[PDB]
From a paper:
To test this, a cryo-EM data set for aldolase was collected at 200 keV using beam-image shift and analyzed. This analysis shows that the instrument beam tilt and particle motion initially limited the resolution to 4.9 Å. This analysis demonstrates that software correction of microscope aberrations can provide a significant improvement in resolution at 200 keV.
Using this data set, we were able to determine a 4.9 Å resolution structure of aldolase without aberration corrections. Using these selected particle coordinates, particles were re-extracted at the full pixel size (0.91 Å per pixel) and subjected to 3D refinement in RELION. 2(e) and 2(f)], which is significantly less than the published resolution of ∼3 Å. Unlike this previous study, our aldolase structure collected using beam-image shift at 200 keV was limited in resolution owing to aberrations to 4.9 Å resolution.
Residue numbers in the entry:
A (entry chain D), B (entry chain C), C (entry chain B), D (entry chain A): 2 to 344
C-alpha cells in the first residue's frame, strides 16, 4: 500500500528549484567553510580570524561582477553567514537572490568515528532538523548540503560504513523533502592513499549503488534531488600516471552504471585538485562520446576561491583584482560545464 | 579488493551481442512456449498436440517473408526446438542466423510456491546451469531468458518474495555472463487483480530497484544485459479507465526512476493485452516527451503470433496468409519501436 | 579484517554493570517521564506543574524504605533530575548509589514522523551524543535508555520503519559502548489497535530479528547490553480473550526464536497494562516450562508508581503511606522476577 | 499479515524428529561421501572402486554391534545407498530404523564458483527439490543435509558470498519444511589458511548471524531445524598454539552470541581434525562453565570412520575387528556428547 510523501505541488516546486540549480551553464560555489576550516585558510594567508574578516571575505565572494550572473546558479553558505548583512544593508540571501542565485546551507554537525572499524566515520546533525530547515526555508534557503566521508585502504570501506552512511543520508534527504528544501547527495570518497583508477571506480560504483538503493527505500523523490560525487581519481601516493581522458571515461562509466536519469543534475567535488586541473577534468567529462542523461556541473569550494584568496592578501585595497581572479575561474568553469573550455 | 568477473574481451562480445539485439527497429519474438502452454493454445484452435505440429507451427513462425528481416533481431526458443530441423534440412538456429537473427532460449524450470506466503512463487532451473548454457553456446544460442512471477494483492508482494526473486535472478545473470551468453532480466508482475496505476507504479519501482541492487551486488556487467519488465497497467477487475498516455507516462516515470542507462536495451512484455493495444501502448511509450537513455522495444509472445494462430486453422494450405498476418503485426511493432506507428 | 571496538577491560566493566543490573530479584524503575508526560499525570491528580513538584515526587520515589534495596537495581532518570538535590543535600545519583542502585538516563529527543508512511515514526537524539554521554558518565550514570515506537495496523510496520529503527538503535548502542555506558534496546510495539496474539507474535519476531541483525552488523558487544521488549499482548479493541498462560507462552516463543543468550538480561515494558495484571503476566512468564538463558525482569514506569501517585494526592502529609504503596508493588514485582509471586 | 507455512501438526512432527535426533548421548554419522570422495579414500587404502565395495563398506558401517544403539541417533546417506539392500535382504533404511536410527540424506549437487570473487563458491541442487524430498520421505528419510563452503583469506568472505549462501540455505530449509523433512544448516568454514582464533571467531559470528537473519526472513520453524557449524580452529599454517580450552571458550562465545535457543540441537563438523583431537575438543566444549541452551553433539564423517577404514584393509576377514574400532570411537564420542569422556 502507498501513502505519498509529497503532494504533486510539492514535487513541482522541488522540480522547479532543482531545474533552476543545474540550468545549463550554471554552477555551485561552496562558501560553507566552518570556523576551523576558514581559520586554517586564513592562517595560510597569515591574518587574524574574526567575524568581520569572514564577512569581508564573503563580501568578496558574493558581491562580484555581473559577469558571474550566468555562471553561479547557487551558493552554499554556513549558518553564521545567513545572519550577516552587507555594507549596503542588504542581507546576503537577498544579495544572492537579486542576481538570480539560490541560497544553500551546510547543515551537518561534523564527523564521528565508527566503533569497531579502522578510522571510518559517519556524520552528525540529525536532531532538530525539521525545525532548523523550516527556519532556513523561512529565511530563503532553498537547497541544502550534507557531507559524508569514505576512504580507501586495506579493507576499507566496510559494508557497515557504506550502509550506515547511505541510511542516514536517506534520512536527511527525506527530512529535506518534507518541508520543501532540495537535498544534494554528497558521497565524498577520500583521494588519500595509493590506489589505481580501477579500485576507485569499483568502490564508488558500490557505494553509489548502495546509496540509491537506500534512497529508493525511503520514498525519495528523485527529481527533487541533486548528486555531489567525486571524480574518480587515483591516489596521492599512486605512482601510476593517467590521462585526463581515462579519468573521464572511468568517471562516466562509474556514473552511467548506477545513476538513474530521473536525478536532475550531477555536480562534482574539487577533491583537492589543482585550480586548473579540476576544470580540465570537468571539461573532459563533458566531452566524453557517451550518452549523459543529466546535467554535469561543478561544485568547487577551494577551486573557485583559492586564487582570489591568494590575490587578496588580507588587505582591502586589492579586492577588485582579487574579485577579478574569482570571475576568471568562474568563466572557465562555466565553459567547463558546457564542454567549450580550453586552457 | 577487486577480482574482475570478465576479461575486457568477454565484455566486448557481450556488448556486441547486446547491441545487436536492440538495434533500432529490431525486436524479439518469444517462441519459447512450453508443452502445456502450446498444448493449451492448440486445444484453443482444436487440433492434436504432436511434435510435428509444434515443428510445423514454428515452420510458420521462423520461415516467414524477408520483410521481417529488419524487424526481428532475435527470437527465444524452447529446448526442444533447438534440436528440430526444417524441411529444407537446415537446423532452426541456422535459419535464424541466416536472415540475421540471434538465437535465444528459455532455460528455467517453472514455478515453485513459497512457504509462509500467500500464493507467491519463485523459479526453478539453477542446477547444471553452466554446462547447459555452455552446450547452448556451442549450439549457437547467444542470449537467454528467465521468467520470475510477482502479483499484486492485499499485502503482496512481500519483501521476501522480491528479495529471493532478485537474488536468484542475479545468480542466473552471473552464470550467463560467465560463459558469454546474454541474460535478459524479466521481472514479470501479474496484471491480475484490481488496482490502479499508482499502486502498480509503486510496486514495479520497488521491485526493480531491489533487482538492480541485487545485480550490482553480484558484479554484473550492465552493458552485457537486457531488461524485460511489464508496462504498468491497471488490473483486469480495475474499474478505473485510463488513457494510453497516462499509462505511458507512468511507465516512463517508473522506468526513469530506477534503471541505470548502462543497460543496453529495455523490451516489454505482452502482459495479456490485445494484439492492437500493446502496439498502441509501445508506440505511446516511445512518444513520451522525456529523455530515454536506452532502446525501448517489444518482446511479445502471444501478441505477435495469436493472429497467425487464428488464421492458421491447423491446416497447411492456409499458412502463407497466416504468415502474412504475422508479418503485418511485426511491421506494426517495428514502427512501434520507432514511434512512427499509427493504427 | 578486524579492529576491535572495545578493549577487553571495557568489555569487562560493561559486563560488570550489566550483571549488576539484572542480578536475580533486582529490577528497573522508570522515573524518566518528560515534562509533558509528568504534566499530564499531575493534571490527572489535579495540581500544578513546577520543578519543586517533580523534585518532591521523585523524593517520594527514590527516598523510600530499605525494603526496596534487594528490589531496585537501577532507575532511569530524566536529564533535569540528575542536577536536582535532595533536602538532605545529597545529589540524587548519590542517593541511588548509596542503597546499591545504578543510575540510568533517558537520552532521546522524541519522535519524528516518517515521510511516505502511514503514521510511523523514528526517534531523535543522535547529535552531540558522545559528549553528552561522557558528561553523564562523569556524573555517575552507568546505563541509558532509548525508546523507539512501532505500531500494528493495516499494512504497518513497513520494512522501512523496522530497518531505520534498528539501524539508528544500533548507532545508539555503538556510541554507548564507545565510552562505557550500557545501552538497553527498547523496541516498543504499540498495543493500540485490534489484533490477535498471533499477528503480534509474528511482528515482534520480525522486528527483533531485524534488530539483532543490525546490532551484529555494528560490532556490538552483546554482554554489555540489555533488551527492553514488550510482552506480546492482543489489542485494546481485540475482542478475543486469552489466558495469561497463552500470552506467556507466546512471549517465550517469540523471545526464544530470536534472542541470543549472550544478552545478559531481558526486562519488560508496562505497555499500558493494569498494576496487577503486568505483575501476573511477568510471574507467568517466569513460570513457563521452557529454557530461558537470561534474566527476565520488569521495567515499569507507570505500573510501579501509579498507585503511589493515586495515594499521594499532591499533599505532603500522605507521602509515607504513598511510599508504602510503592514498596508494596515493588515487593510483588520482586517475587514476579523470581516466579514466586501470588496475588 | 500472516499466512502460516506449517500447520501445528507439521511443526509437531518436525519437533518430534528433531528431538529424536539430538536426544542426550545420541549423535550423527556421515556416510554421505560422494563417488569421487569415497574413490579417493579407497585409493588411499589401495583397492578398486565398485558399487559392491561401497555397499560392503557401508555393511561395515551400519551393521555394527548393538553397543552403538544409544550412540547413533541418525546417519546421513548418499542417494545411491538408499536403494542398496543388505545381504540379509533388508533395505538399509530399515536396518537403520530397526536399531532406532533415523535416515538422513545428502541432497546437494556440489559447488559452483562465484563470478567476480576470488575462489568463492555456492552450492547446487535447488531444482526438482520438492519431488525429490517427497520421494525420500516416502522412502523413509526424515532429515537431510546441505553443505555450503566458505574460506578465510585476504579479503574473503565477501558479503556477497555470505548473503547468497545464507539465502539459498534458507530456500533449502523452507523447501525441507514444506513436506516434513528436517533440514540441518551447515555453514562450513574452511580451516585452510593461516589465521588466529580471533579472526575466525569474528567470521563465523558474522556468517552465522547473517544465516539466522536469512532464516527468520523465510518464516522457518526453528524447532524443526538443526545447526551444523564448525568448531572455531586456527589455520593449518597458523603458527600460534592454543589450548583446547581456548578453542572451546571461543566456540561457546561464538555460539552464544548469535544462536537462538529455539534451535533444538547443534552438531559439529570434523573439520579435518585428528580422530582423537575432535573428541577432545567436543568434550571440552561440553565442559565449558557457561550456559548452553541446546544439545551439543558430533557429526563426524571421517573422524568416526577413518580408523575402521585403516583397520579394514579392503579384505572381508578383518571386518569385525574393524567394526570394533568403529564402535570404540563412537563410545568415545558418546561420552564426548555428555562431557564425561577422558582419553
Amino acid at each position: 500500500h502507498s501513502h505519498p510523501a509529497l503532494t504533486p505541488e510539492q514535487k513541482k516546486e522541488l522540480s522547479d528549484i532543482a531545474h533552476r540549480i543545474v540550468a545549463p551553464g550554471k554552477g555551485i560555489l561552496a562558501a560553507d567553510e566552518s570556523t576551523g576550516s576558514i581559520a586554517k585558510r586564513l592562517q595560510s594567508i597569515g591574518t587574524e580570524n574574526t567575524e568581520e574578516n569572514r564577512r569581508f571575505y564573503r563580501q568578496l565572494l558574493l558581491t562580484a561582477d555581473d559577469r558571474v550572473n550566468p555562471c553561479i546558479g547557487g551558493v552554499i553558505l554556513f549558518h553564521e553567514t545567513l545572519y550577516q548583512k552587507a555594507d549596503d544593508g542588504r542581507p546576503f540571501p537577498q544579495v544572492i537572490k537579486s542576481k538570480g542565485g539560490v541560497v544553500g546551507i551546510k547543515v551537518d554537525k561534523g564527523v564521528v568515528p565508527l566503533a569497531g572499524t579502522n578510522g571510518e566515520t559517519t556524520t552528525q546533525g540529525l536532531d532538530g532538523l525539521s525545525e532548523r530547515c523550516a527556519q532556513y526555508k523561512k529565511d530563503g534557503a532553498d537547497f541544502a548540503k550534507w557531507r559524508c566521508v569514505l576512504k580507501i585502504g586495506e579493507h576499507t570501506p566496510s559494508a557497515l560504513a557504506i550502509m550506515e552512511n547511505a541510511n542516514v543520508l536517506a534520512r536527511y534527504a527525506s527530512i529535506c523533502q518534507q518541508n520543501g528544501i532540495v537535498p544534494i547527495v554528497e558521497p565524498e570518497i577520500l583521494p588519500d592513499g595509493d590506489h589505481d583508477l580501477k579500485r576507485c571506480q569499483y568502490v564508488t560504483e558500490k557505494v553509489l549503488a548502495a546509496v540509491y538503493k537506500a534512497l529508493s527505500d525511503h520514498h525519495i523523490y528523485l527529481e527533487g534531488t541533486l548528486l555531489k560525487p567525486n571524480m574518480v581519481t587515483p591516489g596521492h601516493a599512486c605512482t601510476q600516471k593517467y590521462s585526463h581522458e581515462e579519468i573521464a571515461m572511468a568517471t562516466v562509466t562509474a556514473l552511467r552504471r548506477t545513476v538513474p536519469p530521473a536525478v536532475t543534475g550531477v555536480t562534482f567535488l574539487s577533491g583537492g585538485q589543482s585550480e586548473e586541473e579540476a576544470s580540465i577534468n570537468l571539461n573532459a567529462i563533458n566531452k566524453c562520446p557517451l550518452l549523459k542523461p543529466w546535467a554535469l556541473t561543478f561544485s568547487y569550494g577551494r577551486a573557485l576561491q583559492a586564487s582570489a584568496l591568494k590575490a587578496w592578501g588580507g588587505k582591502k585595497e586589492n579586492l577588485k583584482a582579487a574579485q577579478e581572479e574569482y570571475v576568471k575561474r568562474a568563466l572557465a568553469n562555466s565553459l567547463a560545464c558546457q564542454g567549450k573550455y580550453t586552457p
